[PDB]
Structure formats: C-alpha cells, structure tokens
Design an enzyme around this catalytic site. Structure first.
Site, PDB file in Angstrom:
ATOM      1  N   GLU A 161      22.578   8.680  19.087  1.00 59.61           N
ATOM      2  CA  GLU A 161      21.264   8.267  18.626  1.00 59.61           C
ATOM      3  C   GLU A 161      21.231   6.839  19.176  1.00 59.61           C
ATOM      4  OE1 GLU A 161      19.443  10.573  17.389  1.00 59.61           O
ATOM      5  OE2 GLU A 161      17.726   9.206  17.440  1.00 59.61           O
ATOM      6  N   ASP A 207      14.500  -1.354   9.894  1.00 68.02           N
ATOM      7  CA  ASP A 207      15.908  -1.692  10.043  1.00 68.02           C
ATOM      8  C   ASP A 207      16.427  -2.808   9.141  1.00 68.02           C
ATOM      9  OD1 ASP A 207      17.252  -0.059  12.240  1.00 68.02           O
ATOM     10  OD2 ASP A 207      15.403  -0.669  13.278  1.00 68.02           O
ATOM     11  N   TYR A 241      15.664  14.698  10.572  1.00 70.86           N
ATOM     12  CA  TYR A 241      16.355  13.521  10.084  1.00 70.86           C
ATOM     13  C   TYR A 241      16.169  13.499   8.570  1.00 70.86           C
ATOM     14  CZ  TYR A 241      18.073   8.711   9.807  1.00 70.86           C
ATOM     15  OH  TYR A 241      18.797   7.578   9.512  1.00 70.86           O
TER      16      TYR A 241
END
Ligand SMILES: O=P(O)(O)OCCCc1c[nH]c2ccc(F)cc12
Ligand SMILES: O=P(O)(O)OCCCc1c[nH]c2ccc(F)cc12
Ligand SMILES: *Cc1c(COP(=O)(O)O)cnc(C)c1O
Ligand SMILES: *Cc1c(COP(=O)(O)O)cnc(C)c1O
Ligand code: NA
Ligand code: NA
Lengths: 390, 260, 390, 260
Positions: free
Chosen positions: D48, D59, D174
């Site tokens: 990934e 993030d 995911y």
C-alpha cells in the site's frame, strides 16, 4: 451673569482667567439655543444612530450570576463606534463648535481615548484637531497616538509638570485662552468650568434614557441600582441623569481604589480627597496638604483625572448617589470573570463598575436585586496589561 | 496705602512705575532673596511675586520653568511667606503684590490666607484663575484684612466688566496687553478705567523692552509689569549667580530709566 | 443522500473521509429542522440583537466621495460585538451544536479572528472550546491568542505542513474525525464540505437583509452595486444572498491581489487559481502545477484562505457576480483615506472592498452610482501593521 | 487480477495477508526503493503506497512526517510513478495499491490519473477523501482502466453503506478498525460484507503487533494493513540505513509469521 446655574450646591463654578469668560459665555448661549433647536437635535441623533451605532444593546448576563438572586444587565457602550462612551459627547460638542462658526478643535487626553474620539469626530465633521497629551502618556499610549495621527489630528506632547493628564489639561486651557476666537475646547469629561459639566452630561444622557426604556421593556420595572465607574464622571452621569428623579433607583459611582485607599495610591478624590479649586471648578481632588494638585493612580489609565465632576460631589453630599471604590486586583478579577463567562472583554475602567456589582451579588447571594452596570468601553486596549500582570 | 503712596510720588516726579515679577524661591531661597534685593536696588518701584503652584495655567513656558526650579528647590507656600516677611522687614515702603492661583488661597481657608498676607506685610493679591464673577469671597476677605484685591482687565473687556473691575479693584488695575498667557517673546480701556475711577492701571504681558515701558506710560498707564523677560535672565545665568545679579541690575535700571 | 443540494453548479460537494459523512448528514438534518424551528430563530435573533449588537448601522460617507457622482454607504459590521462579521455565524453554529447535544467546539483560525469569535460564543453558551492555529500564526497573532485563552479556549499550535491556516484546517478535521460524537466542528467560512457553505451563508444572511431594508429606507432604491472582500467568502455571501434575485444589483467580490497578480504573490484563487478538491470541497484554489496546495498571500492576514467558497465560484461562472482583486498598496491607501475623511479605522481586509469602490468612483467621477461596501471589520488590529509600513 | 490471485493462494495456504504501507520517497528515492524491496523480501503479500501530498488530512503524525521527509527530498507525483514502474518491473506479481488524496488524482484529469496507474502496473487506488457518495467519476475511471477502486468501511457503517461498498469496491475492502486518523499508538461488518459478496476485507489503522494480525484473520478478515508502525521504524533509524532495513525485515517477518 449666566443663563444656567454654574453650581451644583457648593460645587462647580467658572474659575478661569478673566480672558476666557466670554468664550464660556458664548458656549453656554450656543448650547442653550442648540438644545431648543429641532434641527440640531435631528442632526445629533442622526449621527448617533447612523454613524456611532446607537442605541447600544442592554445585555442580560446569564452565567455570571448563577447561584444568586441577582439579575445583572450590562449597558453596552463597548459596542459604540470608537469602543467607548466618549463618542456620544464629542459628536455633540463638534456640532456645537460648527454652530458657533469655530473651525478648530482643542482636546486634552490621558489614556488617549478622548484624543481618539476627538480626532474621529473632527475628521468626520471637517474640523482641524489639535490634541494635548502628557509626554509620559504619549510614551505609554503609542497605539492611541498613531490612531489619532492616522485620523489627521495633531498630537502635541506636554513635558511640563508631571507630564500627564492634568498638565495636558493646563496646556489646552493655555492654548484656548489665546485662540478661543477660531477654536473650541472639547473638554473630555463632565468637569471643568461651567457649562462643560452640564453640556457633557446632556450629550451623554442618552445612555440612561436608553437603559430605562430597555429595562422597562425586558423586566417591566426599573432597576434597583445602576452602577458606573467614575474617572471624571461622564459615563456615570450619562447613566444617572434620567434616573435621578426615580428615587427608588440607587445610583452608585465607583472610583478607582488603586493599590488600596489606605496606601494613598488611589484615584478616589470624591470620597478620599479634599475640596479645592482647579481646572476651572470647585470640587474634591487629589492634592497635597499644601494645595498642590496630585495625580490619580489606577491600573486602568482611563481613570486618571485627579478630580471629579461637580454634579457627582453634589449628588453624594445630598445622599442621592453613593460612591465606593474598587482596587486594581478587584477590577482585574472582574475583568477575567467577564471574559470567561460572558465572552465580553471589558475595559479595565468599566471593570471597576462590574467588580462592585459582583461584590453586591457575592456578599448577599440571596438578596433579590436587579442591577445594571454601565459597560463604558471594551478592553481590547487592556489585553497586554492584563496579560503581563497575569 | 503703599500703592497710593507710591503712585502719588511717581506722579509728582512725572514718571511711570516699573514692576518686575519673579517667582519666590527661584532658583532657591537664598538666591531668590538676593535676586529680589537686586531688583529693588536696581530701581523697581514695586514687586509682583509668584508663589510656586503645581498647575500654573495662565503662565507661559518661562514662568512654568521657574515654578519647576522652585519646587526642585523644595520651596513651599509656608517658606514663601517666610521670605515675604524678611523682604518686608528689609524694605518697609515698596508695595508687594502676590500673583496667586486659586487653590493655594482656598486651601486652608480663604480668610486665613489673607490674614497671613496682612500679618506678613503683603499689599495686594491677584488670583489669576478667579474672574470677577467668582470673586465675592476673595475680595471681601481681602478688604477685611486690608489687602488690595487686584483684577485683570482683558483686551476683550466690555463695559460691564470695566465697571466691575473699577469698583471691585484696589491698589492697581492689571491691564492685559494681549490674550494668551505670560511670555516675553510674544487706550480706550485706559480712558474708560479713568472715567470709572479705577485704580491706576499697570500693563502686563510681553513687556520686555525699555520702549514698551515708555509707550505704556504714554498710553495712559501708570506703569508696566515685566516677568518672563526678568525670569529669562535668571534661567540663562543659573550657573553663575554673580552674572545673574549683574545682568538683572542692568536690565531693570534700563527699564526703570524708560519710565521717566 | 442529502436533504439539500451539496453543489452550486459543479462546485462544492462533500469530499471528506467516509468516517465523517454521518457527522455531516447529522448536521445538515439539524440545520434543516432548526431553520424551520421558530424557537430556534427567536433565540438566534435574540442573541444577535441583545448580545452582538444587530442591526448594525448603514453609514453614508459624506467626505470621501466629494467631487464625484458616487454615493457610498458602509454596512458597519465593524460595530458588531467582536469587531467583525464572524460573530453572527458562530452564534448560530453554537446554537446548532447545542441542538444536537454537542458539548465541545472545534475551530480553526488563521489571523485569529475566527478563533476569538468561536471562543466568545463558547464561553457565552457553555461549550468547551478547542482551537487549532498554525504555529506561524500563533506567533504573529499573540494578542488574539491571549484573547482566546482569556475566554477559556484551548489554543493548540499546528507545526505540520506550512504551519498556517490550511494546516490548522487539516488538524481540525483530523480531530473531528475521531470526536464528532461529542464535538461540533465550527468551520470559519462559507467553504468546506456541504452543508457548511449553506449554513454559514444563512447565518450571515442578515447582513444583506438589513442593508436592503436600510438602503430602501434612506435612498428609496436598491444600490447599483454591493461590494465585499472575499477571503473564504462568508461576509461577501452574507451581503450578496438577499440581493441575488434583484438582478439590477451588481454583486462584486474582491480578492486580495497581494504584491500583484503577475508576481504570483496573491490570494485570488477564484480568478487566478485552478479548480481542485481540498478541504472537503471542489473549488478553485492556490495550488502548484502538481496539485499541492499553496498559501494565499496578502497584507491583511484575514484573507489567508487558499481557496474560496463554492457558491462564489458558481455565481462567477454564470456571470451573476464579478470578482476583482486589489493589491496591498491599494488596500493601504483605502485604509488611510477612510481614517482621515470619515473617522473610521477599517480592517485591512475590508479595505480591499473599499479600495475597489474608490477605484470605481475615481475612474469615472461623473458616473452616477449608489454603492454599498460591506465594512466587515474594524482595523484597530491593523494599527501597528499600517504603522510600520508607513 | 493480482488481488484475486494473491487471495486465492493465501486461502489455500490457510493464511492471512500482511500489507505494509510506506510513503513513496521517504526518506529519499534510492532509500525508499530499497525499503520497499526489503518489505517484499521480508514477507509482505502486497504493498500500500502513499504519494506525498501537502495536506494529508486523514493521516496521523507519523505519516504526516513521512510526507514532509519526502517533500524535503524533492519527491513529486511524477517521480513516484517512475518508482512505481521500477517496482513493478522487479516484482511482477505483488499487488500494488496506492493511497491517494483526491486533488492529486483530480489535478490533471481523473481519467488520466488512472490511465497512468494502468500503464505503470498499479492494481488499486484508495482515494482517502472521496466517500462513496462522491465516487462515481473515480470508480468509473478506475474500472475503465482495470484499476480496482478501494472503499473504506468505517466502524459506524450502516447497512446502506455496507451494500454500496460491497458493489462498488474491488480487489479488497478497507476495513477501519476505529475512527480518527492513522496512528500506530492508538465482526458484524465482516459477516455482512461477506454476505453481500464484498471483496476480501483488509483491516487497517493501529495494527502494530503480531497478535493484532492473528486476531484480524481470526475475526474473518483476509489480512491486515500496517503503516505508522512501519514508518516509525524508518524515522527512528534515519541516521543508519543498514539498521533501518534490518529492523524492517525483522518487524515484517514477525508480522507475516503471525498471519499463518
Ligand atoms: O512679562 P510676562 O508676559 O511674563 O507677564 C508677567 C505678568 C505677571 C504674571 C505672572 N504670572 C501671571 C499669571 C497671570 C497673569 F494675569 C499675570 C501673571
Ligand atoms: O497503521 P496505521 O494506523 O498507520 O494505518 C495506515 C493505513 C494506511 C493508510 C495510510 N494513510 C491513510 C489515510 C487514510 C486511510 F484510510 C488509510 C491510510
Ligand atoms: C474615558 C473612560 C472612562 C472615564 O471617564 P468618565 O468621564 O469618568 O466616564 C471610563 N470608561 C471608559 C471605557 C473610558 O473610555
Ligand atoms: C474573517 C474576515 C474576513 C474574511 O472572511 P470571509 O469568510 O471571506 O468573510 C474579512 N474581513 C474581516 C474583518 C474578517 O474578520
Ligand atoms: Na477622578
Ligand atoms: Na481565498
């Protein structure tokens, strides 16, 4: 002779050099006719409304009084163009000046707020502005000085005497004694020689008139007491005026107690000074045992007038109004408390008034009382001051 | 009394009065007393003395600085009255007038201030910030203690004021040569004052040259008062007492000479 | 699906990580019901009136336009509690937050004004306030930071990225993605993911509604054009909203041109940027040829948003509104001119709007035009900045 | 294709997939390529990879710093695609997924970004800030270029979302182990996803310990993705490339071991 009484009981008068009496007499006469002139009133009200922002709001505090039986309202003069109540009167005095054919303006300033207000009214109405400021204050009020200059006003430092507000008041009178023909002296408070105490009150009177109608509307009744800080006396008398005849309403004036009355470092001449003759009037003031005039001390620079308006000394003597003091620390605590619980940064000057309301509430929490504090100004200007102390 | 006498004499000698003004205690007590003795020796017909006040709002820079120098010397109103007594003890006939600001007179009681003036030998008192409209308490106290209450006749004086100044004043009439404040570098009334039997007029403000004294007397005034011009000589010679007195003698004699 | 359209033409949307969509959907739903809830409106209007100071005045400039055929009025949001228009919307979003049962507030701020407004609304309504600010801004906005702290708000510096506003916007979203359950994200402008562009406009819409009624009252007619600066777009859309359907009224938005468009150092993404997807929306922005987001530059710190509200990009595309730019120097000159001739110190942000009105007047002095400039804030905060430059 | 194959194989060997995530270009191009070769050698089943973006709003700090290190190295999207080609040239079968932020995909045209992914050999693309509601243009472009559009199944996912993620996604799903952002130090869905024939689920966010991988596979997930835990090893060994690769091998082998 004069058209109006220059005295409030034994306080007041016109103690100025003989050369200035005709200027004073001309001003009183212009004021008396303007007061009866509908066109003058319409003009004044127009500027107050569309330029200054009147009427100001009357805010009910909902957090600060939690747990007590005190209902506290704040008259928001902090929301007035300029950030202080001073704006109301300088706009009126400026119209008065034009009415007399005067083209220049003279003004004295300590903390700088009156200077700024005089400058903005002059710029708006096309008058040339000359401002006297004690050298010591010029130095400590850099921001207000730039503001004044930015508005086209001439700022002249005064290095004589203590180089503070009282010395600036002297220079303005000196200047005026020689230029009264083309210039008008825009005194900054409800003090000095008649008719200034009377004029400044009448030009600040809308504060109390608005409050009364606003409280009657929101609470259906008059307050138990209205509270205001007293430096020279304009915001206070402006608030008091319309309530004087409503005997059930308490009138409370708060002078700065500085580091504490007993320390001698305060600014509470009304209750802790002695009657003298200065700045063209007979009133209580800060003076030595010799009769030399002294400075007023306070954490808030805007309560630096070493004396007090004559109508206040009078209201006190006949017991119509009560005057108390609040120390620097008490004003500080009130300042912090309002920021944190109501989201309003008050002027350190107004915080003295707030601190007393807080004391009335806290000392007798079960006492039911409807209080109104005159929030004379905003404290953005005090941010750094309160910063360092903290 | 002393003014009446002085003016009678001057009239016979066909001359005008020259009256210097200095601040008591400037630059110090000892030097001030010396300065005053020199002014009299040099020809002064009377003295106009100021008591150091914190806020002299009718004074220009020169005299504002004189007050500062005085305060810097620790001079107080009490010390002034002490000097006043010593001066009177040395010169029994010269008229002595005080230039006061209202608070210093009001401070410990109006009547008490004049009582002290009387016992010290002072002749007149001019309260700079008390107009005729507010003078009742002051002139009455002055009269009760045989002190002459001095009033200012400004240039913008109308008839009513003229009449008041004439009937209320005594000793002499202070005639303002201009508006503004005291400063060295800066007739219809005279006649009317005479018409109304006002005390002899003394012109003041800006009188710094000998010809100004001649012109004042020629205009009908009994004399001239000069302050900043005298005080300036003091400040300019601070570092040298000797030269200060010398220059003071010279200026004063030249000014009095012009009064004849 | 959503209740309201998230797009204005091709601009807008909800480009946020999947985890935040339910928060967004909850907010839109709460907004739609509040909008129909009379009790909610009464409450909002009450605070705007008695706490913020609405309605603000509409001042006619009488000196600045001398010698031309331009009549200029200034909508005085500078007279609003807090000194800027931001106050209107944060009070509404705070009520929205309570309506949803949220007890915490998250906010991003660049120049610090939104931070201060978020803090004051939180203190007033009893909400815990968390404020994200780029480390570089924290450093340059010491006064606003103390103001925020003084009001009980937590100020968290953001050292990531460029350490300015865009990075603070990132941190707020990061925080929210994990705390949306108890906290509400009080976005500072009419941008970001739906429904913020729509909510912020509706909560700023009273500016234009007041202006219309006020101008109709004073001039008997609608303005020829209303002008407002555009940082993110809230004060502008707040002014525009009520006039959008009055096609005869021109709507002009002014972006900062910084040192000049051709220099590349500006903050005018709407007319000189490129459409991208960022901060949860599709709109024009300051970005490199690579697609990396860049900062907006301007003498006024409050026009630092590197993008622009979607409804503006849309109004422009269909030609309903025109957008222009004004350089630092032009904004400066307009700032000085207003202080000197009207006695009003404008925010450097609002000066961009004023400078364009001045240009319209000066370039065609004989053109008869009725203009209204939205004076979004006061410039006391800019005094030192304009000082040094001068 | 590559995902289908990988997952078929893993199923026969009764093991889960371990997928490390690193930022392309961190700490530099040469070192990043070495890091990636080590991850594969050490046991990674797929990769990934993140493309350095200026505002990575999904993030946490660890990866925010990775982007900074990358930018500090002068790394651009163009250089990333160059690395992507070299990686594919070396490892023909490992699935390669890109973790993107919307603007970098939209920048030069959506279809053009996927066309480039296809020609470089990329297998899937996960656009972090594009929810299923705004994915139409993105998944269609992905499908047209044989790229698997990856969708995130958050913990607060309701049934409708579940159904959409199941029909729109490809390659893998995911699965978010928690809300918030990426950070190492921080079942009903799995069943429903299977029920709706969703692509094999890969759990991500916070996976830093070998037992977490075992538990993920035990819970019904086809594997686990670990990023901050890997990136942290890079930042902590910046001054020593050798130790960085060694520690990377050790961590990865331990994590893959746990997938069996
Ligand atoms: O020479 P000059 O200009 O300094 O005048 C001095 C006259 C005496 C003098 C000194 N201080 C004063 C204050 C008021 C006033 F009416 C007169 C005087
Ligand atoms: O091990 P951790 O917690 O760093 O997870 C990293 C997962 C891969 C990853 C990196 N950046 C992302 C942004 C959004 C997203 F949905 C997933 C990721
Ligand atoms: C000037 C000022 C005062 C003091 O003046 P008053 O004449 O005593 O009213 C009090 N509060 C504020 C904010 C002021 O600016
Ligand atoms: C915040 C601010 C702006 C910029 O914000 P918009 O969302 O573009 O309105 C403009 N003027 C002032 C005074 C501001 O405080
Ligand atoms: Na006082
Ligand atoms: Na912008």
């Amino acid at each position: 002779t004069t058209l109006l009484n220059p005295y409030f009981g034994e306080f007041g008068g016109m103690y100025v050099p003989q050369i200035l009496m005709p200027a004073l007499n001309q001003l009183e006469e212009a004021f008396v006719r303007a007061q009866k002139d509908p066109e003058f009133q319409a003009q004044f009200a127009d500027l107050l409304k569309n330029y200054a922002g009147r009427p100001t709001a009357l805010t009910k505090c909902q957090n600060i009084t939690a747990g007590t039986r005190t209902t506290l309202y704040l008259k928001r003069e902090d929301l007035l163009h300029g950030g202080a109540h001073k704006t109301n009167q300088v706009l009126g005095q400026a119209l008065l000046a034009k009415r007399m054919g005067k083209s220049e303006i003279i003004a004295e300033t300590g903390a700088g707020q009156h200077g700024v207000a005089s400058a903005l009214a002059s710029a708006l109405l096309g008058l040339k502005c000359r401002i006297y400021m004690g050298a010591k204050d010029v130095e400590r009020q850099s921001p207000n000085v730039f503001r004044m200059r930015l508005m086209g006003a001439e700022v002249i430092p005064v290095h004589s005497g203590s180089a503070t507000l009282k010395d600036a008041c002297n220079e303005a009178l000196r200047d005026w004694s020689g230029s009264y023909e083309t210039a008008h002296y825009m005194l900054g408070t409800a003090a000095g020689p008649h008719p200034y105490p009377t004029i400044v009150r009448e030009f600040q009177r809308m504060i109390g008139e608005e409050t009364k109608a606003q409280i009657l509307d929101k609470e259906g009744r008059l307050p138990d007491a209205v509270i205001a800080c007293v430096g020279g006396g304009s915001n206070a008398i402006g608030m008091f005026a319309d309530f004087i005849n409503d005997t059930s309403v308490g009138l409370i004036g708060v002078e700065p107690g500085g580091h504490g009355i007993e320390t001698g470092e305060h600014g509470a001449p009304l209750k802790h000074g002695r009657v003298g003759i200065y700045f063209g009037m007979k009133a209580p003031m800060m003076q030595t045992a010799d009769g030399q005039i002294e400075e007023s001390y306070s954490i808030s620079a805007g309560l630096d007038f070493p004396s007090v308006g004559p109508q206040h000394a009078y209201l006190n003597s006949i017991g119509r109004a009560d005057y108390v003091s609040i120390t620097d620390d008490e004003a500080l605590e009130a300042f912090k408390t309002l920021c944190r619980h109501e989201g309003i940064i008050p002027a350190l000057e107004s915080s003295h008034a707030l601190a007393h309301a807080l004391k009335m509430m806290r000392e007798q929490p079960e006492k039911e009382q409807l209080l109104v504090v005159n929030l004379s100004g905003r404290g953005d200007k005090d941010i750094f001051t309160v910063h360092d102390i903290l | 009394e002393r003014y009446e006498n002085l003016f009678a004499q001057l009239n016979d000698r066909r001359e005008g009065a020259f009256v210097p003004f200095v601040t008591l205690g400037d630059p110090g007590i000892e030097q001030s007393l010396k300065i005053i003795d020199t002014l009299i020796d040099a020809g002064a017909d009377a003295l106009e003395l100021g008591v150091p006040f914190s806020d002299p709002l009718a004074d220009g820079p020169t005299i504002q600085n004189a007050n500062l120098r005085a305060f810097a010397a620790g001079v107080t109103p009490a010390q002034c009255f002490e000097m006043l007594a010593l001066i009177r003890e040395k010169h029994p006939t010269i008229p002595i007038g005080l230039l006061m600001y209202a608070n210093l007179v009001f401070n410990n009681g109006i009547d008490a201030f004049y009582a002290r003036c009387e016992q010290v030998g002072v002749d007149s008192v001019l309260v700079a910030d008390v107009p005729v409209e507010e003078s009742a308490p002051f002139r009455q106290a002055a009269l009760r203690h045989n002190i002459a209450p001095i009033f200012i006749c400004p240039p913008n004086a109308d008839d009513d004021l003229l009449r008041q100044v004439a009937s209320y004043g005594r000793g002499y009439t202070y005639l303002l040569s201009r508006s503004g404040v005291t400063g060295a570098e800066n007739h219809h009334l005279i006649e009317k004052l005479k018409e109304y039997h006002a005390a002899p007029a003394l012109q003041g403000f800006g009188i710094s040259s000998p010809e100004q004294v001649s012109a004042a007397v020629r205009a009908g005034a009994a004399g001239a008062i000069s302050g900043s011009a005298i005080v300036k000589i003091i400040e300019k010679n601070l570092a040298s007492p000797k030269q200060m007195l010398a220059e003071l003698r010279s200026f004063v004699s030249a000014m009095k000479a012009a009064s004849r």
